[PDB]
Amino acid sequence: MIGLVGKKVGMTRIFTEDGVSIPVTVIEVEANRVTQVKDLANDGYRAIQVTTGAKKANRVTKPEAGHFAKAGVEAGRGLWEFRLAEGEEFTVGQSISVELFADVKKVDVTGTSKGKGFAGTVKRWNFRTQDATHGNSLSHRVPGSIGQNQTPGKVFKGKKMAGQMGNERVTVQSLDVVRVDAERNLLLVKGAVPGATGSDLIVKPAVK
Amino acid sequence: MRHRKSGRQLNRNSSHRQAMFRNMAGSLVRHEIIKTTLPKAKELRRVVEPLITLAKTDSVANRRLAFARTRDNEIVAKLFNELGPRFASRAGGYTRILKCGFRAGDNAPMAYIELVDR
Amino acid sequence: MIQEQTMLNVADNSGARRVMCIKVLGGSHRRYAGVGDIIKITIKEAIPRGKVKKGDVLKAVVVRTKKGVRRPDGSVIRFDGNACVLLNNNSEQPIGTRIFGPVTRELRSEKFMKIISLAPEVL
Amino acid sequence: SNIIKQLEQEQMKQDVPSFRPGDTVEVKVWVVEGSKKRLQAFEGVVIAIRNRGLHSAFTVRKISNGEGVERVFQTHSPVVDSISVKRRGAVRKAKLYYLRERTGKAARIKERLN
Amino acid sequence: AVQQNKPTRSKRGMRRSHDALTAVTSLSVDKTSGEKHLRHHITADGYYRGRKVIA
RNA sequence: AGCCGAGUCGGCCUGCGCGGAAGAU
RNA sequence: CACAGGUGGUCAGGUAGAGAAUACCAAGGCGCUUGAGAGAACUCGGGUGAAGGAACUAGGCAAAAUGGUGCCGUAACUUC
RNA sequence: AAUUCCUUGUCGGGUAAGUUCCGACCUGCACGAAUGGCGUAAUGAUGGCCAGGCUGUCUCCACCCGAGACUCAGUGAAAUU
RNA sequence: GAUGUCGGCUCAUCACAUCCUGGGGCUGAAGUAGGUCCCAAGGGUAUGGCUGUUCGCCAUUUAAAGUGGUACGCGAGCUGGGUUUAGAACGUCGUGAGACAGUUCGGUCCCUAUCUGCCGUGGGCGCUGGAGAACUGAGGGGGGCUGCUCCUAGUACGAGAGGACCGGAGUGGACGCAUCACUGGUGUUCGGGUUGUCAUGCCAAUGGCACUGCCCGGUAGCUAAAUGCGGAAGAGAUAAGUGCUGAAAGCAUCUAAGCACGAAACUUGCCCCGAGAUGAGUUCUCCCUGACCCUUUAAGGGUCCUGAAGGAACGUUGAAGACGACGACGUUGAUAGGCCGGGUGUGUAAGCGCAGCGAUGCGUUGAGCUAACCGGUACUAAUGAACCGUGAGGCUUAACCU
Numbered sequence A: 001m002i003g004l005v006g007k008k009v010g011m012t013r014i015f016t017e018d019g020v021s022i023p024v025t026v027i028e029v030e031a032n033r034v035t036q037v038k039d040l041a042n043d044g045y046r047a048i049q050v051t052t053g054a055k056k057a058n059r060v061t062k063p064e065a066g067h068f069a070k071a072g073v074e075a076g077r078g079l080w081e082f083r084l085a086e087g088e089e090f091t092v093g094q095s096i097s098v099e100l101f102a103d104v105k106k107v108d109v110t111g112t113s114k115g116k117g118f119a120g121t122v123k124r125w126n127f128r129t130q131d132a133t134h135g136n137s138l139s140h141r142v143p144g145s146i147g148q149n150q151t152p153g154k155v156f157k158g159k160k161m162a163g164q165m166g167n168e169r170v171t172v173q174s175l176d177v178v179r180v181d182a183e184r185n186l187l188l189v190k191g192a193v194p195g196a197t198g199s200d201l202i203v204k205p206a207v208k
Numbered sequence B: 001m002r003h004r005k006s007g008r009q010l011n012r013n014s015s016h017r018q019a020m021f022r023n024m025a026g027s028l029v030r031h032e033i034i035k036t037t038l039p040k041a042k043e044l045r046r047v048v049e050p051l052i053t054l055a056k057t058d059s060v061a062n063r064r065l066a067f068a069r070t071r072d073n074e075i076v077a078k079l080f081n082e083l084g085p086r087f088a089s090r091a092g093g094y095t096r097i098l099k100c101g102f103r104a105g106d107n108a109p110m111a112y113i114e115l116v117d118r
Numbered sequence C: 001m002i003q004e005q006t007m008l009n010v011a012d013n014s015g016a017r018r019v020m021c022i023k024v025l026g027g028s029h030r031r032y033a034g035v036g037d038i039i040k041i042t043i044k045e046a047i048p049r050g051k052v053k054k055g056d057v058l059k060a061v062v063v064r065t066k067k068g069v070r071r072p073d074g075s076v077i078r079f080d081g082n083a084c085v086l087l088n089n090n091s092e093q094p095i096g097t098r099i100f101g102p103v104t105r106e107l108r109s110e111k112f113m114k115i116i117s118l119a120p121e122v123l
Numbered sequence D: 001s002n003i004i005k006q007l008e009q010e011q012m013k014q015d016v017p018s019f020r021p022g023d024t025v026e027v028k029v030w031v032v033e034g035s036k037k038r039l040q041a042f043e044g045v046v047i048a049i050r051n052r053g054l055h056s057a058f059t060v061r062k063i064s065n066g067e068g069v070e071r072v073f074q075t076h077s078p079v080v081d082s083i084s085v086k087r088r089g090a091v092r093k094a095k096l097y098y099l100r101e102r103t104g105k106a107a108r109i110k111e112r113l114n
Numbered sequence E: 001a002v003q004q005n006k007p008t009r010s011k012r013g014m015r016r017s018h019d020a021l022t023a024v025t026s027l028s029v030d031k032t033s034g035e036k037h038l039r040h041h042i043t044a045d046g047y048y049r050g051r052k053v054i055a
Numbered sequence F: 001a002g003c004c005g006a007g008u009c010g011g012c013c014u015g016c017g018c019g020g021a022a023g024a025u
Numbered sequence G: 001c002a003c004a005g006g007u008g009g010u011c012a013g014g015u016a017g018a019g020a021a022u023a024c025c026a027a028g029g030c031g032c033u034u035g036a037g038a039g040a041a042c043u044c045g046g047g048u049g050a051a052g053g054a055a056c057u058a059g060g061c062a063a064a065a066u067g068g069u070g071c072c073g074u075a076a077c078u079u080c
Numbered sequence H: 001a002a003u004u005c006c007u008u009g010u011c012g013g014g015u016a017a018g019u020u021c022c023g024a025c026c027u028g029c030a031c032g033a034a035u036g037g038c039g040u041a042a043u044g045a046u047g048g049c050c051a052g053g054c055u056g057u058c059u060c061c062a063c064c065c066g067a068g069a070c071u072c073a074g075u076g077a078a079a080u081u
Numbered sequence I: 001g002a003u004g005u006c007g008g009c010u011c012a013u014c015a016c017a018u019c020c021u022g023g024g025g026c027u028g029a030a031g032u033a034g035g036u037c038c039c040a041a042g043g044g045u046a047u048g049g050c051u052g053u054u055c056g057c058c059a060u061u062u063a064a065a066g067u068g069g070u071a072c073g074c075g076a077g078c079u080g081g082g083u084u085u086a087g088a089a090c091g092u093c094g095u096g097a098g099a100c101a102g103u104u105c106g107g108u109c110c111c112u113a114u115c116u117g118c119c120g121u122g123g124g125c126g127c128u129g130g131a132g133a134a135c136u137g138a139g140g141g142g143g144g145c146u147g148c149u150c151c152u153a154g155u156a157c158g159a160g161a162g163g164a165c166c167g168g169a170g171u172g173g174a175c176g177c178a179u180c181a182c183u184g185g186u187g188u189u190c191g192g193g194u195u196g197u198c199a200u201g202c203c204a205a206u207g208g209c210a211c212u213g214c215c216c217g218g219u220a221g222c223u224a225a226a227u228g229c230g231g232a233a234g235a236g237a238u239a240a241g242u243g244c245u246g247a248a249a250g251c252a253u254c255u256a257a258g259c260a261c262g263a264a265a266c267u268u269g270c271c272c273c274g275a276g277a278u279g280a281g282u283u284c285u286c287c288c289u290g291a292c293c294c295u296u297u298a299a300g301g302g303u304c305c306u307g308a309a310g311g312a313a314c315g316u317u318g319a320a321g322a323c324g325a326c327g328a329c330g331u332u333g334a335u336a337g338g339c340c341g342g343g344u345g346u347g348u349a350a351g352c353g354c355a356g357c358g359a360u361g362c363g364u365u366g367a368g369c370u371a372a373c374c375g376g377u378a379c380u381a382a383u384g385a386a387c388c389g390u391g392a393g394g395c396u397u398a399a400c401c402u
């Protein structure tokens, strides 16, 4: 099924009457507006494209403005796409709200993770450190050996080394849906999700 | 990583940083326009403007606090007798930075910093 | 958080005073033991005419720790030391007849009801 | 964040009495044993307080049956039924961790009666 | 660690193919005096955005 | 052979194939 | 080499201190002849650490620890 | 045994578990009396073994304060081929 | 005219003669538990005492603690206990200098990476008028482990003692990804106590130096010991193996023609990269509609007028970052600093008055001070311009419009 685009607000907790504390992530989901429908005859597959949010006029270039004016909707801060299943239909200009998740029990959430920059093997791949005493000579956090002798005489592809860590696309699966609030455009899920406060999130019904 | 942190190290240690900025605040208050490096000028605002905010209310306690933070009675007297009254009805922004060229000895970028009613 | 070489006090009247942990039972490569877990021990100090001697090898269960336990609402309970109760190596039942000090509700199982019933206070 | 502030203010208690580090307090908590529910009491000295809105907490220390015990309570949980103040103490610090090394007459605390 | 063969002038040039300098795109003209200056900088006489700032 | 009507049994010499056949970038 | 090395004699202020030890100052003398920014892995010199406490290692290597004055008190053995 | 190949000899003590350590037996491959034999209080930046205290030595690493590494301007090497 | 040789540490990759988990045939296989052979390499596969040891013996665990190749893998990656220099001693051999795959104590481990390789990150040109966005998926990588309790059932089986297949439900060990609401560590940029000495004329009050002088608490950020989630179920074609119908060979026979089952191995289903895929793909939107001259007459060279869509540069900067790169914003404005209100931490400031001989105590007073946080606000700095990029886009053939 289709999903929605939202924004990460923060983390809090919910108290139950039996004395349990549920930690939750709060996601703000405004209305998603349909900009384009893609079908088999003209494109070769079946999907919808949506926008959300708002954008200032003097930051919208003429190509983008023309694309929005064809559909007849106000400009937003981005464009995203979702694939369709058999027996699902939509029309251009239509609005989709967070009441779509009224009866769903579990979701998958996708976002961009925090960036750590250039990282060593101890932090990036969980290598073990060598001795801090007993005569070690300048080799405390270094990686060690990286190969064999004259046979094969090279380094194999895919070796684990130091480099950039984080700032990439990540998915976390099968989170319980704790609350759906339609008068305030809120969705509350159990547990942690990738990203930092204020980043964009994609929410879908669970595949497993 | 330095996520959400504030402050400039300037290739020094803390005692040296503190002493240098004390001296520079004194010089700015005394002359009302000085020439220095751009990062230093950007750091000096956060030290000089709070003193001017403090000097808008005159009391023995406030004078003693200013003395603790400057260690100069001439500077204290100027702050509480001339600059507070001058700025009584302004909400922040008492200084101004203007970029000038590059230094001949080592090619450092340079700027003037001055009080806004000189 | 109990591991190999840890020393513990004894919370029963079987005769032992100080014991040392020599293995954390369970699965392969297991690190720590907490409140409610069973460990293997050797006796390092005993009183003259008790039911156990210095140098024996037995089993025991942990009843108090300095790290503590968490509760479903996020609370904690901590103690000032580490203490245990001695069990029989084959049947896994207590050797003593009395229990000294408080215990916790983590032990409320079909395996440790004698301890729960003999304790002076269950927190 | 206004959104989170609103979500948080609808779960808070409004009956909590006022207390300070160094006082003696009694706390009543719920206990479930099978299909039965009852209340159990915990009394002792307050050594630390954390003021963090819906996320506030406080820590209590006592000596029980020859052993020292400490408990960290979350202030706005419904497991806690009631809090009461039995004595008022006179101290200078905000945290009283030095009491962990004291016993008996050396651990006494003077009375305030402000 | 040192070389086993002497590198060639062709390789020298290929490595240096990233070393050229860049010139300033354009200058700015003050609205009162007519001098040329670096954008967002003061002039050599003491003007900025039409006003005399330094004597 | 199995339960009525043309073939059926087992040794010999010789041509070409089949199994016996598990290793390290 | 305008080199973190080597080279005999004389003079001896104040407060605290057993002291020519050590800390902070006086008279006097200096900031060591490339600088300016940034705030990654890794290397050098240091500060702090939940629970455990030699399980490390050829080996407690290295670190951590003890540390002043007055008084009470102090074992086997001994060439006393 | 600073001496013993066979050998981690056999018996006792210390540890949950001791080819090293301490006490004994005598089958001394191949001890032995001024190229000295057996003992000995005190002394040692001397070789071996066990304990109390203590800890980032370790389970298993986390954060921070400084000097390089990185970028701009000035000067400006080496082994090898 | 030099290819560093035992054991340990760090980090690995392949084979199958398979240690565990998966599927089977025979049993001198009643059940539980075993013995032997065939198929299968997806994932997994101990901590200590002694000794320089690899081995080995011993203690206590585990579903299990596989066997081999890779200069007996790995010193321009680390160690230096052992072998294998110069000092000294014992036993033994020699008249002696000395000697012993016999013992014992001591004993300097160098190199700033040009080329290949590997992990990350940019600049150029191409893809046929130029520009801003969203995608398809040829191809490539990651992941794949397993214990114990309960029901079925004290049933099937068995003289009894014992005790299941098949199918359901719960709770753990080890490993991997993300995050900071809770429990905690750090927090030389926040508050306080205190020892020695120097200064601001002096009292009172403050600052500098002694490892942040020595200490006690602690905001934001980063973070594990903290707390969420994962390994699948389904589908196709099969291995060893089990079958249906059926002749050659009037019977029988899983095979020769036909038909059906069958495993953590194979191809998919889950997650990430991906059109330099030169075989350079698709869809939506936007911009440009002027005059002349020469010549060797063509995908030709030049002059005047014109300069779009968009981009780059500069400035204020970020939970983005070695530098480049990526994201937000530039008066039609909340991008940074300051300023106003709040919150958080520390813990009752200074000045004045009262009590006391005094050190000190009490009131004003939960006072004063308060970084990186939350909600607001144009006071300061983000300047009009200038620069790059053009002027309707080749040839041949086919099918449709005129």
Ligand SMILES: *C(=O)[C@H](CCSC)NC=O
Pocket: I084
């Ligand atoms: C033999 O004794 C050994 C051989 C050296 S071969 C490189 N040398 C010892 O000094």
